[PDB]
């Protein structure tokens, strides 16, 4: 049991570990049901909700990347598999996201910023260069501000794969008006979307 509990789980040996820990009839497709987990482990729905926040079983497609122990199943564009995506970052005075939503996503057509809630951020966000680095308003929130697909709010092009893989691009200026630049927030970022 100690060996089982103290073995690292990575994508390199993910399937091997799954086959070691579960039978041939126990597949991730079967595991994806909360009632299946409850009837397999002899636990209760609220007790397993203590671990898992909310799994989308025909629920809203609101994305909602959040705190450590969240595994989200969702229908995505360029992956024929439900991906549980985990976000953990710390800029100034922020823990999960805070301040509306300042995060990163992988759901859309290409690699860009997040849409945690589908309403566009009222705060005029400017994506500068790397953490605590002034480079001007490169990604200026402007027209279009459209939805029904994960899109860019006037070419947030600074958000790329480099900042997708454990990035440093949560740092962003605040703008009370449309052009009043001031420094509010900056720190480390971590994103991982996994099976």
């Amino acid at each position: 049991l100690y060996n089982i509990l103290t073995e690292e789980i990575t994508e390199k040996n993910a399937d091997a570990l799954f086959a070691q820990n579960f039978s041939e009839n126990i597949t991730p497709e079967n595991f994806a049901s909360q009632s299946w987990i409850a009837k397999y482990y002899g636990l209760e729905l609220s007790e397993v909700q203590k671990y898992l926040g909310m799994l989308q079983n025909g629920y809203s497609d609101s994305t909602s990347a959040y705190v450590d122990n969240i595994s989200t199943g969702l229908v995505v564009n360029n992956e024929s598999k439900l991906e549980a995506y985990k976000i953990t970052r710390v800029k100034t005075d922020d823990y999960d996201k805070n301040i509306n939503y300042f995060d990163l996503m992988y759901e859309g057509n290409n690699q860009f910023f997040i849409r945690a809630n589908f309403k566009v951020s009222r705060e005029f966000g400017a994506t500068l260069r790397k953490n605590a680095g002034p480079s001007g308003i490169v990604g200026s929130l402007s027209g279009p501000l459209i939805a029904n697909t994960n899109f860019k709010s006037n070419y947030l092009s600074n958000i790329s794969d480099s900042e997708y893989k454990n990035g440093v691009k949560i740092y962003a200026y605040r703008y009370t008006s449309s052009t009043s630049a001031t420094n509010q927030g900056g720190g480390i970022f971590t994103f991982e979307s996994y099976p």
Binding site: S35, L45, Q49, M54, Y59, S60
Partner: protein, 49 residues
């Protein structure tokens, strides 16, 4: 009631039969994702209509 061994076995039989005809009970599922609306949202006569 009588706590005899055969009586307890018969009660076991009856209770197993009751479980068999009762099946399996379901649990709460709507409380997983039911949102928390405001009083105005709850009393919206337009939504009710």
């Amino acid at each position: 009631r009588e706590l005899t061994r055969d009586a307890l076995n018969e009660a076991k039989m009856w209770y197993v039969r009751t479980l068999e005809l009762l099946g399996d009970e379901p649990e709460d599922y709507g409380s997983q994702q039911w949102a928390a609306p405001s009083l105005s949202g709850a009393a919206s006569q337009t939504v009710q209509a």
